[PDB]
Amino acid sequence: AVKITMTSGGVGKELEVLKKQLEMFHQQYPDIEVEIIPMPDSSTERHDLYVTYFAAGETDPDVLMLDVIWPAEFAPFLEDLTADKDYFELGEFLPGTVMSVTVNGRIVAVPWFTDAGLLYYRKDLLEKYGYDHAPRTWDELVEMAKKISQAEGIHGFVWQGARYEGLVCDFLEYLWSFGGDVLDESGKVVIDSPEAVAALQFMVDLIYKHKVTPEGVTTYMEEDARRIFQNGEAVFMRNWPYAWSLVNSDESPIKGKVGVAPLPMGPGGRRAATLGGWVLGINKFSSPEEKEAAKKLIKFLTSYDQQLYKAINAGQNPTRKAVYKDPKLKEAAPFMVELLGVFINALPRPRVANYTEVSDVIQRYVHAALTRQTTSEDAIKNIAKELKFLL
Ligand SMILES: OC[C@H]1O[C@H](O[C@H]2[C@H](O)[C@@H](O)[C@@H](O)O[C@@H]2CO)[C@H](O)[C@@H](O)[C@@H]1O
Ligand SMILES: [Mg+2]
């Protein structure tokens, strides 16, 4: 009787799983009908779509699938949910995810699933070549990748190097593990450092010196790296947990041969993973009847049983604490439970209302360095300069 719309991506199996979740939702709320609006794979491109939605004052979409990096920017256009804190049972959620949706003391979204970078590796190939463990340092990964890739005739290491938000997530994991940072605890840009130049040079060296990563990586997003790994054509892959639901399914040629581990440590004496995730917000311009229906859909989708269903079938990490005690979860995706320390310790991108502009600066110069249009020193030097103008 009440019609609402919801945006969704189509990466992996998430759209297929959502349709099934909506079918279960309609059994519980036949008075509400939901239409899915599909989105492009790129988070950067999705961001621009939302800007045009809010600029026009559109009453659709009603439920917004938002990247964890957007709440600070999009808070003026989102329904304030602070009074619904107990309605959504936010006390049951991972506290870090609730902090991500809190903007100036106001709750502007409900956490749906959380994310962190992980290392996928061909466990069969590592044992075949005398390695009983996942690489613990970046240098050990290169050594393993070099030896196995030329013996087997496949790529060593695939990741996300296209000029979009995914590149920033990959770059920060190298920057942080090498001992650098973008901003200090105050506002000051500190990215102009020898550690940052070394981190970016290492990414360049993976392609041109060590030759463990194909130059085509400068066009890869999440799914491009996933297919190459899934088809047995890469020893290592950096990606999010979702890829597990596909590379270990019955349709995968490498099912049962995939291991998951934290990303390796760097010269900074520490390993790091970029915090990711997606949250559900409500369009401020929707009618009050639509907002009420949207609240029921968001509560249903973020309930215990639905978070478990999404985790098992789409490989996306729950935001409710208690789901990690469920034996069904450990059965489907053991790394989600065993590597929980990775997800609570995942480092966030800078939380500023203009992050997408900060990300755009990082995208241009990092990608330019990966394609050899500039050097690592000039790239880092130009990032710092233009970031200081933004901040
Ligand atoms: O590409 C950057 C983006 O990656 C992650 O989002 C993925 C997610 O992991 C997948 O499960 C699926 O939802 O596709 C998304 C990309 O559209 C991070 O969650 C996100 O924070 C990050 O910006
Ligand atoms: Mg509407």
Place of tokens 């991972």: 94
- Domain ranges within the chain, ordered by starting residue: 1-115+276-345, 116-275+346-391
The finding on whether 220 has its CB within 6 A of some atom of ligand 1 is no
> Domain 116-275+346-391, what fold?
D-Maltodextrin-Binding Protein; domain 2 (3.40.190)
> Whole-angstrom Cα distance, residue 349 to residue 183?
10
Give the technique used to solve this structure.
Answer: X-ray
Sign of CA dihedral 25, 27, 33, 37: positive
Q: For residue 367, give the H/E element and its range.
A: helix 355-370
Nearest to 201 by CA among 372, 4, 27: 372
Say how far apart CA 236 and CA 202 lie, in whole Å.
16
For residue 314, which of 93, 15, 6, 8 has the smallest C-alpha distance?
15
Q: What is the CA radius of gyration of the chain?
A: 21
Displacement of CA 245 from its chain's centroid (Å): 15
Q: Which two tokens stand for residue 292?
A: 């009420």
Centre of ligand 1 from the C-alpha of residue 152, in Å? 31
Around ion ligand 2, which residues have CB less than 5 A away?
Answer: 59-60, 62, 290
Which ligand is nearest the CA of 161, by number? 1
Q: What CA–CA distance (Å, rounded) separates 197 from 180? A: 9
Residues 98-127, buried b or exposed e (16+ Cβ, 10 A)? bebbbbeeebbbbbbbbbbbbbbbbbebbe
Number of alpha helices (DSSP H) and beta strands (DSSP E) in the chain: 17, 12
Number of neighbouring beta carbons within 10 Å of residue 307 = 24
Q: Which two tokens stand for residue 79?
A: 């329904």
Helix intervals (H) in 130-241: 138-152, 165-177, 194-208, 222-230
Give me 252's structure tokens.
């995968």
